[PDB]
RNA sequence: CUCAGGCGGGUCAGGAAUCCGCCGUAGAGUGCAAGGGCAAAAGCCGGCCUGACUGGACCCGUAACAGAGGCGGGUCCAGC
RNA sequence: GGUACGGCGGCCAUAGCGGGGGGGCCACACCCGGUCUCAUUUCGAACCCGGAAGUUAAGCCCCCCAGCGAUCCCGGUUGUACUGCCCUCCGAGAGGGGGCGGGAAGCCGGGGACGCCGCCGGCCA
């Protein structure tokens, strides 16, 4: 789409050097949906793809219609930060077109998509273990000071003033790397 | 039905708890507003009740009826507005019948507690009918088990019965 | 605020500063407390006493003491700073009066070989008692300071450009991170002299 | 049917607390020291359920006569017969 | 470390699987009835343990005032 | 003695929530890097360790407001609702009334309110 501010709000971010944010986190889920052999196939292809341990996620209530049980593991996460993020970004974005919906981004400008199969350095190594491939990747933004109301000691809360904004959040995402659409 | 003098009165403690009392009835009266509420109207002929009082629903129902069909015969239904303004929270038990062993009744009806100089209903209309209202304010004190008079009110909300009525 | 049954915090609990349930456990010992905070660039001690009206300190040290006073040249947020800043408070205490007190680390975490044990080691070495386990105090070693001139000198080693970000405002006060204990040695000597 | 006295019998509302009074109060009440001869209220506190008196006595003035561990002993008069309490200093309101 | 519930976003995934943000005075939970109390906890997740121990003193309640066998509870000294 | 500096506290919303303007002697922050200390049921995100290249954008500090919340005073509703004692006072009854003594809640209008205190240090002097 066309974002009307883009000017000015450059101007902003020229202006003051410490209202630019940054990619704080990027988070990848599988969602196996089962406790089997799959499970164990996704771990390690996320371990081989991004570097880290896995973490198992286990489901909260029972529900037999999904046949899963309350406790069980089901999906798997991963959690990048850093210039290592940045990289893994830039891969899994250049692996689908470099296009992102522009109704995607949140309210406070965080974006997500989902990728349905590895095609990012992929690696055809996928008969071996593959098939449970799949990932929901989402990326955090933040301007710099957002650590106080992380911060256990004198922890406050940031004003509506210094937080993003879904415009500020997709013309970053345009100014640093890649091109928004129309969505229809 | 027991006459209605056992229930007139109110030196008993207010019975309304639904979750505790347990089978009490249902309300036999659903309607509480009738004609055109959204409509501008001068004059708000209002009842009142000169003492404090218990009105069953049975005599609630009986009185919103007659007044309605007056209303509806010699006005028409968007000519007028007529609301009760009270709704039956009080819960009405029997003695079941042993005799006095056990005592504690069961839940047999509902009603209305009402305290002095108390709005029941109210009748909204115009100066062209305002005769009409009169009128269905007296057919509807003539149900209730007490004393009671009739106010009528500009849209300001004083009292002018007696220069309307004189006029 | 949304109503009249929003309870709001006392205002230190609010601003994030003190733990009153900590607080009333500390308080119910009855003697003097030695209350230790850290910040970004400096350590302070202080030994503190309960008063209804409002709590009372004694006496007071801060870490720009040993910059102005005694002679500084190195950062004032380290473990060797701490401990050096934990063996003043101690003497100044003891010229004070007081002998014994109670660590108070506030809200910080109780991690083994941090800064506020380091201040601990250096006032119970001064001579001020303080209940304890030496377990939790950090290592020798690293409270002379080895491991900062360890770690300057694997930077020289090295591309010096890391040395240089690491260390450069050292370099302009005009002291070398090698030497280090040496200079630690030094201030400890003249504290010593002074105070006894 | 009659029922016997048990510790919170018929205390909805004298244990209760304010909505805004919620969590534990300022320390001054817990720290606060006593002499003997003194006289205190007893206004219990609901949130600290250590060193309670029986609600029973909740809003009357005793006499201190003591100390052992951390609570106060008072000296109350139930009718004509006299009953000692333990009272931890929470519980206890100095009277001016 | 902070809950229930909700809003916006995301491959399979749908009202409901797992995830990313914002709001959120407790609207959750606390083994079981109800009431009371609990938010850097008394709730959720972990590490270590067995004070759910031995020898005793005094005091309150059942049983107001006002008598009590048995029983429950509270404040303490010593040992480990 | 000055300071748009910090640490420990008392009353615990008249102190909160939400907004506007301004600042960085020192100091507090964000911020830079994870060899060592310390940790992730993955992640230097938090906690911990090592500092000063950069910024006052945020926290923090100073001044302002009456939008939500809280609460203090004045006037009206009003000595209204309710109530203690006496009564050979009125009522078929319900319930009212006379004398003496207390006295609301909510609402309407006008002001207040964007905290007040204690101890000690940093910088300057």
């Given at each position: 789409v066309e974002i009307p501010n883009k000017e000015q709000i450059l101007a902003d971010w020229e202006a003051h050097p410490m209202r630019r944010p940054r990619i704080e986190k990027v988070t990848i889920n599988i969602g196996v949906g089962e406790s089997g052999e799959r499970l164990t196939k996704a771990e390690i292809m996320l371990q081989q793809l991004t570097g880290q341990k896995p973490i198992r996620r286990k489901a909260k209530k029972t529900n037999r219609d999904f046949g899963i049980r309350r406790g069980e593991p089901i999906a798997v996460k991963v959690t990048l930060r850093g210039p290592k993020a940045y990289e893994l970004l830039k891969r899994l974005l250049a692996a689908v077109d470099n296009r992102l919906k522009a109704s995607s981004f949140d309210?406070?400008?965080?974006?997500?998509?989902?990728?349905?199969?590895?095609?990012?350095?992929?690696?055809?190594?996928?008969?071996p273990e593959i098939g449970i491939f799949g990932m929901d990747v989402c990326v955090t933004l933040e301007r710099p000071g957002f650590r106080?109301?992380?911060?256990?000691?004198?922890?406050?809360?940031?004003?509506?003033r210094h937080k993003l904004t879904k415009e500020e959040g997709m013309v970053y995402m345009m100014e640093e790397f890649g091109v928004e659409i129309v969505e229809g | 039905?027991?006459?209605?003098?056992?229930?007139?009165?109110?030196?008993?403690?207010?019975?309304?708890?639904?979750?505790?009392?347990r089978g009490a009835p249902g309300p036999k009266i659903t309607i509480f507003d009738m004609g055109n509420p959204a409509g501008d109207f001068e004059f708000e002929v209002s009842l009142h009740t000169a003492e404090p009082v218990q009105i069953r629903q049975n005599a609630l129902e009986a009185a919103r009826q007659q007044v309605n069909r007056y209303l509806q015969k010699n006005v028409g239904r968007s000519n007028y507005h007529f609301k009760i303004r009270v709704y039956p929270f009080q819960v009405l038990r029997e003695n079941p019948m042993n005799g006095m062993r056990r005592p504690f009744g069961k839940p047999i009806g509902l009603a209305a507690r009402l305290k002095k100089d108390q709005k029941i209903l109210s009748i909204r209309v115009n100066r062209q009918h305002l005769k009409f209202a009169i009128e269905g304010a007296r057919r509807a004190a003539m149900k209730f088990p007490c004393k009671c008079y009739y106010r009528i009110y500009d849209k300001e909300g004083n009292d002018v019965t007696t220069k309307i009525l004189s006029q | 605020a949304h109503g009249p049954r929003y309870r709001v915090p006392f205002r230190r609990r609010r601003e994030g500063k003190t733990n009153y349930r900590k607080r009333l456990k500390l308080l119910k010992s009855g003697k003097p407390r030695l209350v230790v905070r850290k910040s970004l660039n400096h350590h302070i001690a202080q030994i503190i006493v309960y008063d209804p009206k409002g709590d009372r300190?004694?006496?007071?040290?801060?870490?720009?003491?040993?910059?102005?006073?005694?002679?500084?040249?190195?950062?004032?947020?380290?473990?060797?700073?701490?401990?050096?800043?934990?063996?003043?408070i101690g003497y100044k205490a003891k010229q004070a009066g007081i002998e014994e007190a109670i660590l108070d680390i506030g809200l910080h975490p109780?991690?083994?070989?941090?800064?506020?044990?380091?201040?601990?080691?250096?006032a119970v070495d001064a001579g001020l008692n303080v209940p304890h386990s030496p377990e939790i105090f950090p290592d020798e070693y690293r409270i002379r300071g080895e491991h900062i001139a360890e770690y300057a000198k694997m930077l020289k080693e090295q591309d010096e450009e890391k040395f240089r970000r690491q260390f450069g405002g050292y370099l302009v006060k005009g002291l070398d991170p090698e030497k280090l204990p040496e200079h630690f040695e030094e201030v400890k000597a003249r504290i010593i002299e002074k105070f006894e | 049917v009659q029922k016997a006295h048990s510790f919170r019998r018929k205390t909805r509302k004298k244990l209760s607390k304010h909505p805004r009074r919620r969590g534990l109060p300022p320390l001054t009440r817990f720290l606060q020291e006593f002499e003997v001869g003194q006289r205190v209220h007893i206004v219990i506190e609901p949130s600290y359920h250590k060193g309670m008196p029986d609600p029973r006595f909740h809003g009357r003035t005793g006499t201190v006569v003591g100390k052992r561990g951390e609570a106060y002993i008072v000296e109350i008069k139930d009718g004509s017969k006299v009953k000692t309490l333990f009272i931890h200093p929470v519980h206890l309101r100095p009277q001016k």
């Open positions: 309210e406070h400008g965080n974006v997500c998509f989902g990728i349905e199969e590895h095609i990012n350095i992929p690696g055809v190594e996928y008969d106080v109301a992380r911060r256990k000691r004198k922890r406050a809360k940031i004003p509506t | 039905l027991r006459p209605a003098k056992i229930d007139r009165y109110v030196d008993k403690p207010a019975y309304t708890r639904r979750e505790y009392i | 300190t004694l006496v007071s040290a801060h870490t720009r003491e040993l910059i102005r006073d005694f002679g500084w040249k190195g950062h004032c947020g380290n473990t060797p700073s701490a401990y050096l800043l934990g063996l003043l109780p991690v083994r070989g941090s800064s506020v044990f380091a201040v601990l080691k250096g | -």
